[PDB]
């Protein structure tokens, strides 16, 4: 329950952001998202929704007990900045940041465009 | 701009993939190879550097990422 620090996994996309706080070896400690907060439609894709997600997840995580986190960013979208600022505000000192945006190295065929 | 090649200035040749000391400065963070227009090497030497770096990567001397 009570631990020292973990990680911040922030899977931001065009439709939703999903914040997940985990221990350094992996086993999770909290998570939340815009739909969890109660957002709908395009509101899920918002920095405010990412902010509220980080708020709720940090509240639960601090209720368990911790102080600081590393930040593992992944994906497009603009919730990154607002969510990180809200981590700082709700208390978790942002130890460090790194993006792990997967580079396919030309690995897979992506689907067609949204026309033709 | 007129710039100088490390290789030309140093009079080095027969680039071995073992030469991490020389290959690692032609690499940016997370292992990416610097462009020729950044560094200032010739095409021949640049291609030899590409091959040497890829050899070093597969042989663990240097990383693909991070």
């Amino acid at each position: 329950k009570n631990i020292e620090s973990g990680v911040a996994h922030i899977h931001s996309t065009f439709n939703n952001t999903i914040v997940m706080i985990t221990d350094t070896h992996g086993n999770a400690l909290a998570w939340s998202s815009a739909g969890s907060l109660g957002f709908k439609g395009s509101k899920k894709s918002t920095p405010f929704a990412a902010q509220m997600a980080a708020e709720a997840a940090t509240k639960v995580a601090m209720e368990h007990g911790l102080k600081t986190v590393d930040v593992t960013v992944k994906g497009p979208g603009s919730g990154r900045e607002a969510a990180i600022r809200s981590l700082q505000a709700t208390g978790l000192e942002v130890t460090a940041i790194r993006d792990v945006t997967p580079v396919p190295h030309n690995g897979c065929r992506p689907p067609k465009r949204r026309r033709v | 701009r007129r710039k100088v090649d490390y290789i030309a200035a140093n009079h080095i040749e027969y680039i071995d993939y073992k030469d991490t000391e020389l290959l690692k400065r032609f690499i940016s963070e997370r292992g990416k190879i610097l462009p020729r227009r950044v560094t200032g090497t010739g095409a021949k030497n640049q291609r030899k550097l590409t091959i040497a770096i890829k050899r070093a990567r597969i042989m663990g001397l240097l990383p693909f990422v991070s």
Partner: protein, 153 residues
Amino acid sequence: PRKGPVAKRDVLPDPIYNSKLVTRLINRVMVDGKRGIAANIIYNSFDIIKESTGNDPLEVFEQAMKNVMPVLEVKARRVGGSNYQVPVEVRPERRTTLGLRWVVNYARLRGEHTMEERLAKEIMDAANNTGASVKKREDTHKMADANRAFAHY
């Protein structure tokens, strides 16, 4: 307009209380240029407020405006296939205009026998946070908080 803002004519004070809110409220409640009838209505209403309350009518009206004036509007914006609202920090003059408008409209909507009584009851209810104008305030703020996500827009 296309050519930038427009500066408005100043406000004339009230003869007896020496205030601008009072004169602008006269202008609000007025219909067909009848400053006399409007001013009489307002002075008699504030006489009722003096009668049923020892506080100054002007202070009670200030309190009502503090309790009705919003801080956040909703402004409409049409993004292609969906038109939706956006919260907007309200300019201090727009605050007072909306306050007077809400007060006066819901006052004349109230079902009493004279505009004097209607306005006095509405102002006192607003100062005690019980009026339809305060309902309107709460509705606008709740919509601002429900569409708060568009802070960037």
